[PDB]
Symmetry: D2
Subunit: 481 residues, 4 copies
């Protein structure tokens, strides 16, 4: 077997080592062809047809590029082809755990269907990787190309999910610490996964990408930091790193958290919950699983993709009627109606455990407007979105090491004041979107009154359209006037 | 209801009239989200994730652009908003008839499954359009925006499939003849459908586009030709028009007729044929249809998409075992092996009626080589591909009208000799690809000997790798030496 | 005479009205072919070969696009083709006043050569426009295409420089106030000039533009604000407007204020000052002007371009030896050496009249380090750069009017807190770059010590490389560590 | 002292070895900043502001890419860093010999000014390279980085101009023959110089490039051909190679041989001829040269750039009045008027010796039309353009070696019939453009009659607009009817 070339629209001609080809040509990997990268986003951005499969190839490619470039610039690092292949495999395989419509499945569906369980795509990726290796006799092939399966499978899993539990990693020692910063960077979030989707999502969405990963790679070096060898950026590049996170935030606002994209994801999740008792997925030993339980058996999970959406939509079973009708409403674009958006003020943060109480609170508000219809908790959806620079309220640039032209081996820190006074003072916030399941002109008018009243009651920010949608409510609040 | 904006990666911000929105937001239209533009092409170009739906939006947009630009430059044409909307709807809806994996369904599957029937995606588009209109109460909405359903539905169908059957059209008179040249140009093949997929397919494939549709539109005018008003191009654009067809041919060789893309389409078609007796699709009145018969009932056809591939792949029914195993082999990349390509010489053209005889002919060849295994007709696939400039052997530029700067209202013809002696002397040819279902080293060696012998016997062109794959065979033929 | 088409790499096919063609085809306009958009930037970004000429065509085009789009969406505005042509001419002509190397001439050279005079490129553009009109008999051509020269020439000049010599404008009344916001927006800086150079500079520099002007135009409307008709943006676009200024700041940091680009501009300015007594430029009546006085006669200024650089570089006159030697040093790349960058802390602002005292201050600093060479005021250059959102310390988004979907005719304001807590808290800052004219290793070491000491003395920010370039100095300051 | 990074819009971040930096930072190299790549093309495509300097950096970069990729894939080639640097320097320096407005100088001006001399930009590049090396003490720096000046300077010159004189090269032996195919490919014209300008010119012109050099590099290998090691392409890539030359032809038609671009180059050449007696350029020992004689002294040639255009345009000397007036007419766009284009039929080829007789022939034609004005030889310009695939009438693909996947070390040939019957039957042709120096309506009408009559007399092709511009003439010729 020899190397294969793939032509990617983002990266151009990608060379794949024969071991990588063997991992890719499995049911467990090919499954990613049937999961949309941006899930419900496709229903708002018709260009966003792209699947997790091509994203995965790109992450593998970029992982290879970064590790190769470090090895070429700094031969003293003793980066081995074995190291390169392991970093490529981790890059290729870190998306294996995604379920139907990607972030909708682990972000929305599993939390509601299985509140007791703690599930992440990262955990899923490790389980599916193990299933891929074991089901397809990969370990012999790994040894053929000079890999140490016990050590290297551990190394690959650690790159994906972090320590599997003082140096906490078993796959590689402290002198190769920098290898763990490439595929999934737990220290500051600067990794090749972000670089691929920035470029790929933008290409498909019709938004332009402001971040130059190629420049970052050219200016990356490994330096000693606190007795670890770590990837350091050139001091001058600090502005571009702030801009990388700015780009991420912009993509979330414009696309990933698009108000309609989110409500379509919500409606699909509701359809999946109503279908969950009736859809059967055959796993290991012919045992039957549900959408919600396929995560417990990787053989079943292998066959759980966006297809479930079409199975429900095209079904005739009366049991699936309620689920089917929700998806049919999506096709007619009879969506739950966006009422508006607000933000908590100051340090106020809404907790996960409180999310279910929020619809009741909106319905409980007393507007001081004559209302045609009276709305109930069940008529409202409240979506809370945490927007940050990937480290909650921490500045990720405080967790980056830099080097200077005059001393390229010496790691330094750069503080925010050393860069620009025009940068963000805060690095996290919450967006609260409210929608109404009643699409009536009178119901929507009522929903707007409840919403703006709830905002005033809770001292949330004035909705941007507040003076138009609720002219009788907005005056009461002095902060808004 | 008001206009909606869609952000497309190819076209940027597209405005959609509310009537267009109502047509788009139907099960019959949204179905195109679940049919890949390039079918098996996605399995060779991982970027080609794009579906018929986003292509359809683009064709609608470009149809609007061309008709608007003509109206702005030449108010004397009396192009009406009613005309603009009808051209947009035809552009939007000309892809409605595509089936699973697009050209695979009407190009490969239906011809083999239902040899008696004459089926085209164009015919399918007209039937699905009628079903869309009737199922969703569109006619009242058409009248609301100033359309006359009887005349305008006729006009839209005629733009898609041509005369429904001396001016042969009923939807519009001879003074609006140019409107029929926009969406599906039967005269010379220069239409907005080609312009969208050139740009869209290239964007996704990773291949570059060498055609400027925007320039064509800027230089397009309507002039009188033989008592018809027709779209004329500026004389100096003739080179760019030859290049447009050159681009089309390049995309076919590189992507649409990729040898592996074609064999994957062949293998999927074979799986569909083996599954056809057992897959049931519920149509009108709860009646059950097969993959092959869903084309007879638009309610059933509405639910026939690429999903059928996954229904088969994920099935447990023993009846579907043979179909399922073919798709599983695709996932393992255990594909039928490409043996080589040849061309007929001179005028020789192979017709469909003896396509089935070609595998037997290859197996019947007697290469003067000692062979380990002896191969049978059933072990060979022979794929014949007609490559042309869209009008069989004819030069489409002989069917284009031009105008000169000094007389912009006066239509002229331009001959090939007036342009360049570097242009093609022929405008059609055939490619013959041969594959072997036996994938072992000995069988592949034997297949290569049979193939090159068959080429020599039939006076076909010397395979490019002929001297390497069959060094004992190639010397016999003097034309090759 | 009819419309001409120009193919621009940024905008594609641009249509130019015959009146626009007549203005463009003059010595006064064609002169912009010989002035680089980014001046010294070309010597750092080899792609930045682009001249003011092609920028001007783009500004004219975009001015036309915006005014046309407003007129199409809101016919009630009664925008006339006379209005469209006047806005296009202003867009085309607002760059006519630029001198050699663009911002270097009005930003650096004229302030030093002629401190008494107040000169701007805007004033220059008005003078050159008048000279263009009068020298080329344009007024008759304006009348031929329905313009009224007296009113319309006033309107065009007002669009370029603002109120010519209570509604302060004479060219158009308050009901056409929005027309003054297109070409040069004095209210908030959102104008088509910025949109062209963002896209054009990025195309040439090799950095990507993430501002979407086309989307802005689609969402622009005219609404009543304080008894004026003004351009309003859609409320939801507020994020993209913050991002537009973010983009502008990024382009300044990365390119326009590149430390080496700036020093090359400084060195060229110094060469021009030393050549100013000796270069003669023939103006009106054969009278002779200097580089510094050509601004006083538009006939002379017509012949003042980047060519002056080459006239000096290629000169043999002993009088020009000092000027010539500076330019020759640029070619050998031995330029003045960058020592470092610092910022004033908090609100501290360095005044224009204090700039010349700063080199003396650096030379006067007493670093507690043993020094091989002692440097003098003349050996230092101190460059102060004001970085802002185009309205000094003011937030330009406080000066933008928005509209909501539910009330598209009703203008609203949006405050920073209503948008995001991640946005800048400040909208202006100063960067201070220090360079040394002595390039030897010993002199550069000394320059670094003086610089970091000066920073500590003045409580400026710690240079990013401070611990490397001045390890003995940095410890003294506790704020730095 | 270390590598420098340059951000190029085409190639992104380019790394330059310190030796390359030293060669670049010289008057002889920096001179290329003041010569437009496409000369008069800028006066038709305002985007084409790009200079020979940035093209040169790109050619150096791509030369490096190809040699590096071959070395990585085939270590057995024993490609050395010394080899890599020499190939990069040749790539960087092969444009050093270009004069004002690039191809205008060696294509039009020198042939007319100095008919006795044989001058090429390639010869100029070798002379300027020698001058660069000797003037700037480069030889010591070459030795510092492991080059052997005697052998390596020979090798570099040979890559640029071919043998300086059975193996005809002295710089490297037959086992490194493939190195001579990278920078300037005399065998088939497939070189990195073409790859850079295709991408760079397209970026600036606003035309799209359909050639993928990156793919070519990935599929390039070295194989033995007739006892030489040569670069071979993968068999499958033959289509893309035909397309590469198709792209080159398209760029020539659309841009490089644009009818107006060519006439502006003609008018500038005429201005240079009229100025040649009076412009003085100081060379070595203070000796004075003319535009036409600066090629004899590299010190003088160093100072001969596009600036000469502005020196003439801005001059006051009465001696330069005639030259100055031609350039002033260019600014007013009072260009010689395009009359039309024709082609010789069959094999007929117009010789260089005959070019001057062609204006007389047009003026001598007797159109059967009543004419207001009678035109003379001096009133006509006849421009003859040879359009080919870079090897006159030969197919360059007949001069390419390929390899097959089954035998990657075995070189093969591919014939045209093995590829496609849709490819060109001829690989060279001539375009004849005619212009009139008399621009008035009556003179232009007369010029059109003479031109179309001359075409009929000489059995040239029917002008595209023939029936519009000469309706009385076209009928006489029955080949045209
Ligand atoms: N731009 C372009 N890409 C192509 C063309 N033909 C194939 N590709 C792309 C599609 C796939 O990503 C890949 C096809 O495989 P390669 O050509 O790299 O060769 P390989 O030997 O790996 O596979 P193969 O046997 O050719 O299918 O390259 C072509 O003519 N042009
Ligand atoms: N390039 C770009 N595209 C955007 C941006 N924001 C949204 N888009 C895309 C998403 C959609 O395809 C289109 C605009 O859709 P909207 O965001 O207005 O969504 P929708 O129509 O559901 O909202 P609305 O009717 O205004 O409540 O453009 C942006 O800032 N930049
Ligand atoms: N992409 C492309 N651009 C072209 C081509 N020929 C010219 N251009 C450029 C030159 C100009 O900037 C622009 C269009 O100008 P034209 O020369 O076509 O002018 P116009 O239409 O007035 O025609 P004319 O020259 O009077 O026959 O496009 C071509 O074949 N392709
Ligand atoms: N893409 C990109 N290119 C940039 C940026 N800033 C500068 N460039 C360009 C300028 C140069 O052509 C190249 C890198 O040069 P540098 O910025 O490193 O400048 P320089 O070598 O003077 O810096 P140094 O001496 O190392 O401090 O990229 C940026 O933010 N993004």
């Amino acid at each position: 077997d020899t190397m294969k070339v793939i032509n990617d629209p983002i990266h151009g001609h990608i060379e794949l080592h024969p071991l990588l080809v063997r991992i890719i040509d499995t049911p467990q990997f090919q499954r990613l062809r049937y999961i949309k990268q941006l899930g419900g986003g496709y229903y708002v951005f018709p260009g966003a047809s792209h699947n997790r499969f091509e994203h995965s190839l790109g992450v593998g490619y970029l992982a290879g590029c970064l590790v190769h470039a470090l090895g070429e610039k700094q031969p003293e690092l003793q980066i081995s082809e074995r190291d390169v292949l392991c970093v490529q495999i981790a890059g290729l395989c870190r998306n294996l755990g995604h379920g139907p419509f990607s972030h909708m499945f682990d972000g929305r569906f599993i939390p509601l269907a299985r509140p007791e369980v703690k599930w992440t795509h990262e955990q899923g990726s490790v389980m599916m990787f193990e299933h891929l290796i074991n089901s397809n006799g990969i370990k012999p092939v790994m040894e053929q190309y000079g890999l140490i399966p016990e050590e290297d499978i551990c190394f690959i899993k650690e790159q994906i999910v972090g320590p599997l539990e003082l140096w906490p990693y078993k796959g590689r020692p402290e002198n190769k610490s920098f290898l763990y910063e490439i595929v999934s960077n737990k220290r500051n979030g600067i990794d090749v996964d972000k670089w691929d989707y920035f470029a790929r999502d933008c290409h498909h969405l019709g938004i332009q990408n402001n971040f130059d990963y190629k420049r970052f790679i050219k200016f990356a070096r490994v330096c000693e930091v606190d007795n670890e060898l770590r990837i350091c950026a050139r001091d001058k590049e600090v502005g571009n790193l702030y801009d990388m996170f700015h780009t991420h935030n912009s993509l979330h606002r414009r696309a990933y958290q698009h108000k309609v994209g989110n409500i379509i994801d919500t409606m699909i999740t509701d359809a999946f919950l109503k279908a969950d008792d009736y859809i059967e997925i055959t796993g290991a030993g012919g045992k039957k699983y549900r959408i919600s339980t396929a995560i417990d058996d990787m053989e079943a999970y292998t066959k759980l993709t966006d297809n479930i959406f079409l199975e429900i939509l095209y079904s005739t079973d009366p049991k699936l009627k309620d689920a089917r009708e929700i998806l049919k409403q999506i096709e007619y674009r009879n969506l739950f109606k966006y009422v508006g958006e607000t933000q908590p003020t100051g340090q106020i943060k809404i907790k996960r455990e409180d999310y279910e109480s929020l619809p009741k609170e909106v319905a409980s508000a007393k507007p001081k407007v004559l209302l045609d219809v009276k709305l109930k908790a069940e008529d409202f959806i409240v979506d809370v979105i945490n927007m940050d620079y990937g480290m909650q309220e921490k500045n990720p640039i405080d967790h980056v090491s830099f080097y200077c032209k005059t001393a390229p081996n010496r790691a330094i820190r750069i503080t925010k004041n050393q860069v620009s006074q025009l940068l963000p003072e805060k690095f996290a916030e919450q967006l609260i979107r409210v929608y109404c399941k009643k699409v009536d002109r009178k119901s929507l008018y009522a929903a707007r009154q409840y919403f703006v009243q709830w905002c005033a009651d809770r001292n949330f920010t004035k909705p941007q359209d507040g003076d138009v949608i609720a002219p009788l409510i907005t005056p009461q609040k002095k902060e808004w006037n």
